[PDB]
Ligand binder design. Structure first.
Ligand SMILES: [Zn+2]
Lengths: 1076, 144, 54, 348
RNA sequence: GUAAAAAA
């Protein structure tokens, strides 16, 4: 029925609700004796156990159980037969011991008092209640409980009974020399005034009650030991009542004994109410026992000792389980106990130290609480906290690069409050609130079900929404999967208590059952507040390597699971050290992801080193980071990035001599390692002026205040400086200004000229900035050029792909930017782009047999290829003869389409090979991409636009020749007719999209609008009828409002509410959310 | 432990052994791992003999009462060992206590490989360094 | 009752990376008991009636 | 040997410009390769293009390097001192790479032949039809029944399955998904005329088994049709790793209501991850990334357990996995019940 | 394959 905290709570309530329990007017005393039955399992006699089990059950079952206890135990080369004592590792051992302990309970209580405490058989008592008050007060033993082999007895003695009992005890064992106090037991965890120095009478009564119970038990079966026993006496002199139960130190103080008029209200004290007069008659103070503080410390010790060799994430998960089980078990007692909180702080420090040593053998000054406590979705370890960790605003700083430039924010600088990592002690509800809330939520749910069946409707989530994570057990447990087997599952708490004898793996959640109690905690609020206290996702991803990987949004980021090298590779027969390294590969993933915030001088103070072939400064030895960075910048990728950037900029300069009046552009090639030389620099690009230019003052690229100096100049340089910025230093504007000033005012640097501009690129954060002089044209030209470069450079594409493969990240279809409105406008640049469509290729039609069955008979298709810059339409006609005799037909349709597209690119000459390809289907990317491995300068992307090449097939002549095709064919058509000569390619493409979507939405009205007069004739080598400009725009408007009306009648949306851009989006093929 | 140890008596039980077995099974009930060293047989031997003695006395009680007719019909109730005779699709729980099954004329391939590997493993005595030293002694002899 | 028992043994196997021979055969016995619950019940009751040495 | 193109091994695609023949005698005769550390735009881009989609990935490649290293100590001093040689990748010989290709061919051929839902035009009738008896067949998907035994109270369940033997309905195509939506609409209308609500689910929880990706339609009565998100929420919150890498429940219905339209499911989950998804609407529902292969139930046991828990059922009927048959009387009965709503019929 | 002229 109850969790052990609820058992402790009920024991406090039963003590408080006994008759006159705090009354000490007539000299009556109260005794709690807790003790342990010593060596019970060891001293069980198997013949006697067979007799007692034969009493309660079938003799075959009893004989099975005792024969099962008589076995041979082996450990390595040792063996013996167990012939005396029970085996606690059998599955039914908890049952057998609870029955045996019940017989021992009968021995301790006596049959009559046991019958009174248990109540009549037909109407048994509730726990710690009696039938009536005289039955309660008949006998000195008021409360009894046994928890496996721990027993607690609450006795109430009158003065006469106490005198008789102490008289008999001192008659048997006489000792006047005042060592019963110097040998007694008391609680050293409570205050001294919560206790006191002891007294002769109370001490004699305690040892005398212990003596009486020990006289009740026969030593051959079991005894109770004074070193196992704690006794507390509440008298007129000691107004306190002490006991421990299942981890909780409990001190009860009556309100009639408290010495203060008012009470400091605590969230950590139980207020024991009388169940008759209904006022709070006592206080219960709870602490955690030092034995349990030691148990938690040993559990963290076990984690560390077995976890020198495993991952940071498994270490964090084990810490999380330990901490959440500790706090959700103890709750108020945990925050009351001062030694437990110090232990938690020390253990959290040890866990983070383990992660630090596994990252680098030398201790740092400061890792961020960001890297430790960021949730696992953002690549953090996801640790919980039971301490108070300061989050500095130096960690909360973050910047952002937009087309305007760089924006800097210091989150937290709204307030002077210390942002802290939150505490699950604040996020978990106390036990008293849990019990009251459990009562009210189950009454509420029963009533809500009553009105639901009254009005004869459905229960809704809005009904069962407020009462969701509440109760003991939970409404959640009403909604879990199995419930019949749960009705038949009995004894699960005792079963777990004995599961320690069957399994090596200790359960920190031994006390609760998710199948029965349900999950008694929730950390959604904790995780949101952890993100907000860390400073937001943007601040966290400023700490991480999210900028360098080139992903749009942190939503839709998925981390691939990487642990299965145990099953995958142990067939190689690895060494202990080898499989430890394989177990710690997830650590290279974590280290690479959190790399910008780790190797910082402020973190690892010391003599920095420099990574070979790069310009990365390494602060301390982080070997997994070094290995990953070598795998990324292998094959001289740093210098090759510098070379590709210089080549692209010189290509832009070569195409813009006439625009900037540049006589010639020079490409210096004397220094191949100046890119990752960081002491000084030479120049990369040289500009020779055809005419004397007036340049501006030295300023940043995005500065709008140009002060053109009167100094005339003729010779210029452009210097590209690469960078791998850490989190402390990734301000590329400040870096470029400082390095430019130093490299110009320092004489070991030899620029070839006295005018120039320096562009610097931060690779770790995907940033760039420039500083220097400007003659007119530089700011706009370099802006467009560098935007296109860092969105388009293939060396940077290789770098981004390598970082993605080394993090093993995947993304949802908020993926790399497909075709949209912006790149829809950007089709019509100088680059040769080309659409590939394949949805019309593999066509199958349903044919009805003479049996009535359906056959998916294939017909011919056509690979569609469309150059929009020239309005060219290649068609590749594929036949049923090709489709014959193949399995996995759609898959090999995609693979064939890739094969013949690659064949056409092979047949194409170098001057006519396309720069960029756009595929309509997103499934074509892998086959086309691997067949264009041979042509990697081709950039292949996908389209989010659903263009109507279905309607292009639906054109009459093309469909007719596809139907009349017998062999494969390859033909070429024109789609712009003469609109290339009449109008712009932009307007021609817009008209083409309009007419093709009109043919998509209908055919009869489309062709009627295209041919409203029979005088208009479509000639041979043109596909569309010849019209004038006014006739063409009239047909355009007619098809536009036809498509708009069809969309309106299909989606029940008014036509007039759509803007021009929205109408363009329906015309293109996009989907827009409803404006209402 | 249950069959091949040379201290295991597989001869028929004497009358003193039977009296000791019944007397101890009355004293320490169903405790066969305890009973077996005192009797002197294995626990499975003691248990199987004890149930055989009980079934024999049951059959002699039935024969003395004469509930059944002539011993030439099919009206006899099956024995305890007959009920314990395996179902189609029932596993023996104590094949280590059952005696050994003789080799067939044609062995199967697992058994030929088992015999070959037994011979090789019994013959082998050396470790890897000792084997390399013998190999390099021969190679140095030939090189010289 | 049997499904509860087998679920308890399987969750004793729940978080296990490397399995030894007895662990793999106990998983196999559990899935055989899942596939043939009646046969397992007859075998269990036969063991409870008959076996006294383990 | 027998075609074996890049589609069958993506590393069988043109020249390998990342490799370099080893100068030693064993590098001549065995055929080891090494790293081509002087490589360009072309070479690097071709390498990444060929090596996306590899099982394991860069973690598995570093694992292979460690498994080769016999002097390997799991020690930071060792890792720092041997960082260069450990960082150096390992590239397989073309013989082993062809062994990989022929191994995946044999496994894929066995799976493709044994799969009870594939449809190909190669083998003769009556083997051309799948083991699942086809009822209504669109241009590139079709529909059959759920196998016996079914969950009592949810009888008459269907499966919508494409012709293409995918592993994900995120791998499925746009027109496949459109006529899957049409099948979903038709089944929703059919079950609303039946008086019951319907839910749909995809069990992509074991992508390494390469099952045929099918969308199961389960009909449930009205009140638990209202309370179904609570059951599936509880099961996906309790049935996986407690300290999960991602969010335990991703609400595609909530994203669709915010602004993703139909495209919430297909634009919310990466196609390379193992998942389970349940639709209550036509545009949404909610799903889960399966991160603990041991703790997650095997096969379709998760959805069978949840559906039985709503519709309180015999646990034997729950954990009895369905088995397909070719000739099936209740398939004939469901067809003679289904033929009213069939948009494939009104297309034909 | 890393650490001595019809039986990795
Ligand atoms: Zn299939």
């Amino acid at each position: 029925s109850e969790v052990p905290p609820l058992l402790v709570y009920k024991w406090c309530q039963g003590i408080n609700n006994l008759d006159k329990v705090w009354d000490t007017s007539n000299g009556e005393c109260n005794v709690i004796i807790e003790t342990q039955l010593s060596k019970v399992y060891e001293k069980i006699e198997l013949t006697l156990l067979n007799s007692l089990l034969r009493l309660i059950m079938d003799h075959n079952l009893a004989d099975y159980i005792t024969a099962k206890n008589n076995v041979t135990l082996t450990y390595k080369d040792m063996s013996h037969v167990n012939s005396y004592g029970m085996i606690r590792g059998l599955q039914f051992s908890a049952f057998v011991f609870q029955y045996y302990g019940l017989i021992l309970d009968l021995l301790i209580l006596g049959p009559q008092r046991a019958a009174e405490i248990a109540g009549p058989p037909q109407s048994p008592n509730d726990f710690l209640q009696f039938q009536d008050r005289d039955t309660e007060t008949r006998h000195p033993i008021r409360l009894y409980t046994r928890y496996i082999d721990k027993i607690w007895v609450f006795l109430r003695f009158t003065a006469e009974e106490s005198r008789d009992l102490i008289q008999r005890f001192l008659t048997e064992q006489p000792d006047p020399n005042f060592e019963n106090v110097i040998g007694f037991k008391s609680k050293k965890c409570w205050p001294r005034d919560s206790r006191m120095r002891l007294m002769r009478h109370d001490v004699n009564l305690g040892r005398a009650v212990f003596w009486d119970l020990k006289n009740r038990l026969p030593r051959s079966v079991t005894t109770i030991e004074w070193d196992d026993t704690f006794v507390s006496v509440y008298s007129k002199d000691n107004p306190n009542l002490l006991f421990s139960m299942c981890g909780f130190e409990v001190r009860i103080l009556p309100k009639c004994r408290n010495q203060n008029d008012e009470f400091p209200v605590k969230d950590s004290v139980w207020s024991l109410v009388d169940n008759s007069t209904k006022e709070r008659t006592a206080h219960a103070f709870l602490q955690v026992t030092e034995e349990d503080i030691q148990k938690f410390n040993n559990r963290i010790r076990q984690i560390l000792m077995s976890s020198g060799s495993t991952t940071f994430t498994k270490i964090a998960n084990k810490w999380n389980t330990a901490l959440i089980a500790l706090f959700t078990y103890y709750r108020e007692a945990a925050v009351s106990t001062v030694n437990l909180l110090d232990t938690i702080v020390k253990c959290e420090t040890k866990i983070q130290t383990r992660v630090k040593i596994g990252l680098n053998s030398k201790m740092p000054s400061r890792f961020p609480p960001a890297v430790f406590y960021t949730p696992k979705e953002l690549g953090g370890l996801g640790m919980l906290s039971g301490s108070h960790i300061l989050i500095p605003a130096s960690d909360k700083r973050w910047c952002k690069q937009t087309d305007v430039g760089i924006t800097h924010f210091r989150a937290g600088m709204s307030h002077d409050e210390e942002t802290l990592i939150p505490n699950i002690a604040r996020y978990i509800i106390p036990w008293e609130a849990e019990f009251i809330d459990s009562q009210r939520v189950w009454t509420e749910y029963s009533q809500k079900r009553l009105e639901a069946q009254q009005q004869n409707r459905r229960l809704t989530l809005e009904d069962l929404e407020d009462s969701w994570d509440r109760g003991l057990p939970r409404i959640n447990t009403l909604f879990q999967k199995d419930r019949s087997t749960l009705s038949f599952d009995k004894g699960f708490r005792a079963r777990a208590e004995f599961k320690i004898y069957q399994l090596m793996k200790s359960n920190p959640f031994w006390w609760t059952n998710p199948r029965h109690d349900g999950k008694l905690w929730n950390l959604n609020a904790y995780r949101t507040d952890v993100i907000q206290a860390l400073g937001g996702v943007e601040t966290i991803l400023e700490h991480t390597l999210f900028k360098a990987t080139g992903f749009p949004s942190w939503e839709g980021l998925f981390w691939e699971k990487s642990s299965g090298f145990e099953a995958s590779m142990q067939f190689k027969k690895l060494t202990n050290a080898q499989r430890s390294g394989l177990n710690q590969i997830p650590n290279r993933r974590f280290t690479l992801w959190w790399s910008p915030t780790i190797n910082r001088a402020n973190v690892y103070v010391g003599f920095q080193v420099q990574l070979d072939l790069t310009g990365i400064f390494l602060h301390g030895k982080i070997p997994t980071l070094k290995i990953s960075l070598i795998q990324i910048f292998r094959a001289h990728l740093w210098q090759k990035i510098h070379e590709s950037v210089v080549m692209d900029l010189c290509q832009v300069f070569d195409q813009e001599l006439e625009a900037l009046s540049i006589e010639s552009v020079q490409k210096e090639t004397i220094h191949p390692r100046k890119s990752y030389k960081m002491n000084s620099s030479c120049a990369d690009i040289q500009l020779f002026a055809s005419h004397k230019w007036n340049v501006t003052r030295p300023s940043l690229l995005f500065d709008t205040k140009d002060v053109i100096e009167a100094t005339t100049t003729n010779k210029f340089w452009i210097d590209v400086q690469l960078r791998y910025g850490d989190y402390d230093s990734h301000d590329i504007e400040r870096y470029v200004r400082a390095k430019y000033l130093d490299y110009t005012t320092d004489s070991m640097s030899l620029y070839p000229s006295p005018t120039g501009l320096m562009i610097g690129i931060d690779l770790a954060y995907n940033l760039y900035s420039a500083y220097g002089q400007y003659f007119p044209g530089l700011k706009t030209l370099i802006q467009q050029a560098m935007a296109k470069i860092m969105k388009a450079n293939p060396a940077l594409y290789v770098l981004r792909e390598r970082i993605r493969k080394g993090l093993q990240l995947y993304a949802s279809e908020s993926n790399q930017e497909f075709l949209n409105s912006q790149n829809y406008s950007e089709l019509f640049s100088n680059q040769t782009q080309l659409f590939i469509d394949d949805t019309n290729v593999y066509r199958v039609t349903i044919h009805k047999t003479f049996e009535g069955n359906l056959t998916t008979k294939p017909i011919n298709g056509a690979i569609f290829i469309f150059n929009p810059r020239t309005g060219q339409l290649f068609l590749k006609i594929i036949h049923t003869s090709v489709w014959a005799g193949q399995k996995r037909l759609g898959q090999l349709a995609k693979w064939k389409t890739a094969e013949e597209v690659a064949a056409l690119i092979r047949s194409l000459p170098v001057e006519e090979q396309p720069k960029q390809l756009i595929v309509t289907r997103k499934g074509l990317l892998d086959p086309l991409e691997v067949n264009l491995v041979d042509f990697p300068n081709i950039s292949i992307r996908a389209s989010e636009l659903q263009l109507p090449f279905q309607a292009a097939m639906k054109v009459e002549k093309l469909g007719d020749m596809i139907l009349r095709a017998t062999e494969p064919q390859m033909v070429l058509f024109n789609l712009y007719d003469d609109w290339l000569k009449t109008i712009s390619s932009y307007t021609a493409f817009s008209r083409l999209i309009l007419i093709l979507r009109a043919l998509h939405v209908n055919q009869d009205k489309t062709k009627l609008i295209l041919r409203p007069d029979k005088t208009v004739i479509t000639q041979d080598h043109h596909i569309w009828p010849s019209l004038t400009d006014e006739d063409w725009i009239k047909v355009e408007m007619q098809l536009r409002d036809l498509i708009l009306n069809d969309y309106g009648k299909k989606n029940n949306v008014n036509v007039a509410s759509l803007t021009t851009s929205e109408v363009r989006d329906i015309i293109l093929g996009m989907e827009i959310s409803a404006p209402s | 432990n249950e069959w091949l140890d040379p201290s295991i008596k597989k001869i028929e039980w004497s009358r003193e052994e039977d009296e000791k077995l019944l007397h101890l099974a009355k004293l320490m009930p169903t405790q066969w791992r305890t009973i077996a060293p005192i009797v002197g047989r294995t626990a499975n031997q003691c248990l199987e003999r004890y149930q055989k003695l009980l079934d024999e006395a049951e059959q002699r009680e039935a024969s003395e009462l004469g509930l059944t007719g002539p011993d030439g019909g099919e009206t006899r109730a099956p024995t305890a060992e007959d009920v314990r005779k395996l179902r189609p699709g029932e596993i023996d729980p104590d094949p280590e206590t059952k005696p050994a099954r003789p080799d067939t004329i044609d062995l199967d391939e697992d058994e030929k490989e088992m015999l070959s590997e037994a011979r090789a493993r019994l013959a082998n005595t050396q470790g890897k360094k000792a084997k390399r030293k013998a190999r390099e002694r021969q190679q140095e002899e030939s090189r010289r | 009752i049997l499904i509860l028992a087998l679920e308890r043994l399987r969750e004793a196997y729940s978080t296990k990376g490397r399995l030894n021979q007895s662990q793999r055969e106990e998983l196999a016995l559990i899935e055989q008991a899942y596939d043939s619950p009646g046969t397992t019940l007859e075998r269990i009751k036969r063991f409870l009636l008959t076996q006294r040495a383990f | 040997a027998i075609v074996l193109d890049a589609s069958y091994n993506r590393m069988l695609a043109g020249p390998r410009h990342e490799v370099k023949a080893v100068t030693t005698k064993r590098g001549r005769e065995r055929g080891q390769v090494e790293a081509n550390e002087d490589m360009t735009i072309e070479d690097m881009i071709s390498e990444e293009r060929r090596t996306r989609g590899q099982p394991g990935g860069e973690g598995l490649r570093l694992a292979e390097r460690i498994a080769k290293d016999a002097r390997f100590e799991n020690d930071l001093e060792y890792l720092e001192e041997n960082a260069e040689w450990l960082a150096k990748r390992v590239h397989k010989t073309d013989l082993s790479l062809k062994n990989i290709a022929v191994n995946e061919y044999q496994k894929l051929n066995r799976i493709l032949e044994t799969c009870p839902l594939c449809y190909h035009e190669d083998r003769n009738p009556p083997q051309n039809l799948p083991i699942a008896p086809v009822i209504s067949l669109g241009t590139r998907t079709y529909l059959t029944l759920a196998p016996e035994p079914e969950i009592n109270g949810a009888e008459g369940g269907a499966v919508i399955v494409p012709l293409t033997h995918h592993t994900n309905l995120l791998e499925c195509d746009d027109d496949e998904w459109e006529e899957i939506r049409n099948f979903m609409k038709s089944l929703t209308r059919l079950y609303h005329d039946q008086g019951r609500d319907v839910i749909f689910y995809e069990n992509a929880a074991a992508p390494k088994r390469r099952q045929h990706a099918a969308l199961v339609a389960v009909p449930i009565p009205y009140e638990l049709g209202d309370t179904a998100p609570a059951f599936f929420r509880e099961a996906m919150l309790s049935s996986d790793e407690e300290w999960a890498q991602h969010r335990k429940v991703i609400d595609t219905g909530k994203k669709a209501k915010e602004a993703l339209g139909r495209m919430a499911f297909r634009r919310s989950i990466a196609k390379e991850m193992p998942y389970f998804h349940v639709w209550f609407n036509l545009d949404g529902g909610l799903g889960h990334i399966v991160e603990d292969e041991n703790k997650w139930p095997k096969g379709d046991l998760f959805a069978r357990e949840v559906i039985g828990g709503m519709l309180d059922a015999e646990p034997d009927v729950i954990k009895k996995q369905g088995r397909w048959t070719r000739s099936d009387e209740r398939v004939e009965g469901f067809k003679k019940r289904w033929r009213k709503f069939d948009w494939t019929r009104v297309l034909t």
